Each structure stands twice: as structure tokens, then as C-alpha cells.
Amino acid sequence: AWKGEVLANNEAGQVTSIIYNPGDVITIVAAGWASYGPTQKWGPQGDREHPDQGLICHDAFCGALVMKIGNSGTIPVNTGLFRWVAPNNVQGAITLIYNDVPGTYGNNSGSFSVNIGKDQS
Amino acid sequence: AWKGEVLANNEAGQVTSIIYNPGDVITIVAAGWASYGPTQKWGPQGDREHPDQGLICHDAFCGALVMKIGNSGTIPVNTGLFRWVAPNNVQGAITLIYNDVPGTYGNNSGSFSVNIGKDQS
Amino acid sequence: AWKGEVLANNEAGQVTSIIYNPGDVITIVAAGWASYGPTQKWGPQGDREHPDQGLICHDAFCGALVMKIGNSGTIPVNTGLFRWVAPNNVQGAITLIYNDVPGTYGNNSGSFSVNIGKDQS
Amino acid sequence: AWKGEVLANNEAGQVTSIIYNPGDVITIVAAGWASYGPTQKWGPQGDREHPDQGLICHDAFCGALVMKIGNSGTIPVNTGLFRWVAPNNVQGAITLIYNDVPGTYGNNSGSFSVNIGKDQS
Ligand SMILES: O[C@H]1[C@@H](O)[C@@H]([C@H]2CO2)O[C@@H](Oc2ccccc2)[C@@H]1O
Ligand SMILES: O[C@H]1[C@@H](O)[C@@H]([C@H]2CO2)O[C@@H](Oc2ccccc2)[C@@H]1O
Ligand SMILES: O[C@H]1[C@@H](O)[C@@H]([C@H]2CO2)O[C@@H](Oc2ccccc2)[C@@H]1O
Ligand SMILES: O[C@H]1[C@@H](O)[C@@H]([C@H]2CO2)O[C@@H](Oc2ccccc2)[C@@H]1O
Ligand SMILES: [Ca+2]
Ligand SMILES: [Ca+2]
Numbered sequence A, B, C, D: 001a002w003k004g005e006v007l008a009n010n011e012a013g014q015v016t017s018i019i020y021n022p023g024d025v026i027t028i029v030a031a032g033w034a035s036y037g038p039t040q041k042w043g044p045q046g047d048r049e050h051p052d053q054g055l056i057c058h059d060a061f062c063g064a065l066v067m068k069i070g071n072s073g074t075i076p077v078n079t080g081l082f083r084w085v086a087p088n089n090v091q092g093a094i095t096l097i098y099n100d101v102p103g104t105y106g107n108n109s110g111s112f113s114v115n116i117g118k119d120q121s
């Protein structure tokens, strides 16, 4: 299991200790407050009012929590995933990432606190 | 396990199929968008800027997800609870409720989608 | 979860800390060596060659591990149970018992080491 | 999770669907009756009275259930393993095998029924 912070200004993402393997079932719960620039902060689903101007993940709002498994494309996490199984052939370390436009992370602030565990399978 | 929706305008709350028993460990993940009145919506942590004017749960923000276990007082859920154990003396069906002031639910909108499961113990 | 020893000479059984509730899934693993009288010992499935002379559980061999859940009749445990759900309407404290004839426990010897856990549900 | 039978006369062992990965926690429960030649049968702990004449696993009795993880050496399973973690560096497919002397499996009979699952981690 893994517990840590995912900083909004971390463009590279936060590598976790979870290595997602075929057949694994995982649960993620994310909390906290972060911003992509403005003074306001949003929770792990991000800002539903802000248009997508080239986000790393088009399947979640600006300022949402997303992830990559190994070198997968970005997958939404938002507030978390409950007893979740990955698509076939997706495997590897989970990196958690704040959803913003590449090269625009420098004015971000805050972080999300995240727990990830493997479930029975 | 249980999965279902909790409407923001449902003052009485949504009953689940989860019966919390002594020693049980549970995980909850909540998602979605709701409002206590304004045209904006907030996630399951609610609106951190809005004063408490008599909320059903003083330990979470206005517009947060909270719960009762049996006849307990309100307990915060927010985006969820990871491998969580209830206080001593708490037992019974879990009811999920949007955090607002009694009698003021009629102008609320939206809902949260919630999963609850019992973990290993 | 519970871990402990179940003595072969204990007629009343070893009352565990596990309270089986409706919907619970449990796993039991039992090990060790015990006897109902003879100098030879057998594992948790008992002695397959010994006739049933009035055993507390007719559904397992003499010297097997069995249980009662609450006020239930005896249920075989043998080497254990994997992600097991009880029959409808069976619930309460799990008592583990060595399978022998009532009144004949005084010449028994040995014990089984048992783990019981609740699984996800 | 995996469920299947391990025949006592199967010198090559029974390959399972479980790929043990670093960090995984597993539970195994084994049941049934088998023999390494004699007319008696023994449970998954084997025959505690028969000396080791060159068994594939020197850490378990003759007629016990054992396993290999990947190309590891044999590891005892007996009646099962409860929320068990492998030694560092051991990984790969779990193969279950009856403990007997190489080249002497042809007179064996019976089998063990085994369940393996991954636990929370
Ligand atoms: O760093 C910038 C970068 O994160 C950009 C990407 C997310 O769309 O959004 C800007 O913020 C804006 C706020 C309101 C209107 C337009 C842009 C941020 O300042
Ligand atoms: O239904 C009302 C009730 O939910 C109230 C309680 C939660 O604090 O909030 C009002 O909304 C306001 C919005 C801005 C300023 C003041 C009140 C809502 O209109
Ligand atoms: O305490 C007695 C009681 O446990 C009995 C019940 C289980 O069948 O088995 C006897 O042992 C025997 C040994 C040899 C032949 C017959 C009985 C035991 O001596
Ligand atoms: O196939 C032979 C082989 O499985 C051997 C290995 C296990 O020690 O045991 C023999 O059975 C014996 C039984 C009693 C005494 C000696 C050998 C078996 O007949
Ligand atoms: Ca930014
Ligand atoms: Ca309202």
C-alpha cells in the first residue's frame, strides 16, 4: 500500500510504490485542495468550469488527479477508484499527476493526499 | 458492497445496504458534483469558503458528503474513507447525506455517486 | 482476525473473537496434530478409518476440526474454508471444536493451530 | 484467484493461474486425501512418521503439499498459508506439487483440492 502527497506543481508526477500487475484490483482515495494558477483551489475532480486548452488528460477536468500505469496514457483518478481493474495489457508503476497543460505547472499550488491499496483478487 | 447515488436535495439521506457491525473495516469512494443553492457546483468535500450556518455536520464543509451509522450523529465522509473503523458504540445501517442546514434542502441540486465495501479484518 | 489453538480435549470448544455477521465472507486455515484417544495423531480432517460412534458432527471424520456459528449445528471446518459464506440465517460467535463423541474428550490429546479472518465483501 | 486439484501422481506438478509478484500477500487452503503408495491416505501435511528418503521438499513430510514460485526451490504449503508473503526476490507462477521422491510418483493416488487468492496489500 502507498500513501503520499501529489503536488500540483510537479509536472513529472509522483511515482508511487504500487506496481500494477495483471489481475490486480486496486482502490484509491484522494483528498485535498490544489490550484492550476488561480487563487481558488479545487478538490481532486478539478474545476468543471475551465475549458481544456491542451490538458495531459482530456478525460478529466483541469486540476483533477490522473494517473499513468507504466507508460500508459493518462487515466482519470479524480476522488478515487473503487476495486478497480485496469484494461488488458496495462501494467507497471502507478504515477499520479495533477492535470494541467504541459509547461504550465510553475504557477500551480497545493497538493492532494492519496492512499492506494491492493484489494483481494 | 454497495453502489448508488445520494441526491443533494434529499434531506432525509440515502439508505445503503451496508450494515456496519463492530470490528468492520470499510472503504468509501465518493464522486460527483452538487450544490447547496448557488449555480456553481462542488465536489464531495463541499465548499471550503462558505460559512457554517447550522449544518447537519459541523465537522465538514457545507456541501460535503456525510453519513450516519444507525442512530449515530453525523460523521464526515468527504471524498471517502480508506480502510476505516467506526468509533466504539456505533452500529447499523449506513445512511449517506448531503451536508446542508435543516429545512434548506429544497434549492439543492446534483448528486454524489458512492461505492462502499467491507475490507479484510 | 483471530489466531489461536483448539485443544482436542476441550469438549465445550474454543470460543474465538470472530462474530460472523450476515454477508460476511471468512477464510479459515487450520494445522497441527491431535487424537481422540489413540497414541497416533491425525490432521484437521481427522481419521478417515474410524467409524462414527456418535460424533458431535456426522458430516466430518472423527478428530476433524468443526465449528458452531452462534446457536448453529456443527459445521465441518477440516483444513479450513476459503472465502466462505455461511448458510442463510446462521450468525454469531464462531466456536471451534474437536470432533469426538460427547463425554469422551478426557483421553484426547494435541491441538490445532487456527487462523480466521474476514475477507472483503 | 485460482481453484483446482493437485494429483499425488503428478510428478511435474499442477501449474496455477497465480503469478506471485513482489509485495503480494496470498492465502492458500488445501484439502483432501492422498497417498505416496500405501493403502492409507494422508491429508495435506502428509505422514509425519515416514522418514525422508530423498523428497523433493526436505522441509515438509512425505505426502505433504508443497509449491514452487517461478523457479524457486520447494516451499511447504501443508494445509495452507494465511496472509503469507514470499521471501525477497521470489516471484513468478505458483506450481503446486505432492511431496514424494523423484521417480516414485507412479504408485501414488488421490489428490488435494486447493484454493489460492491474493489478499489486501
Ligand atoms: O498556468 C496556467 C495553465 O494552468 C492554464 C491551463 C489550464 O488551462 O490555465 C491558466 O489559468 C487560467 C484561468 C482562467 C482563464 C484562463 C486561464 C493557468 O494560469
Ligand atoms: O439554501 C440555502 C442554504 O443552503 C444556505 C446554508 C448553507 O449555508 O446557503 C444558502 O446559500 C448562500 C449562498 C451565498 C451566501 C449565503 C447563502 C442557500 O441558498
Ligand atoms: O475416547 C474414546 C472415543 O473418543 C471414541 C469415539 C470416537 O469414537 O474413540 C475411542 O477410541 C477407539 C480406538 C480404537 C477402537 C475403538 C475406539 C476413544 O477411546
Ligand atoms: O513409491 C514409493 C516412494 O513413494 C517411497 C518414498 C516416500 O519415501 O515410499 C514408498 O513407501 C514406503 C512405505 C513404507 C516404508 C517404506 C516406503 C513408496 O512405495
Ligand atoms: Ca498552471
Ligand atoms: Ca440549500
Ligand SMILES: [Ca+2]
Pocket (backbone or CB within 6 Å): C036, C037, C100, C104, C105, C106, C107, C108
Ligand atoms: Ca476420546
Ligand SMILES: [Ca+2]
Pocket (backbone or CB within 6 Å): D036, D037, D100, D104, D105, D106, D107, D108
Ligand atoms: Ca510413491
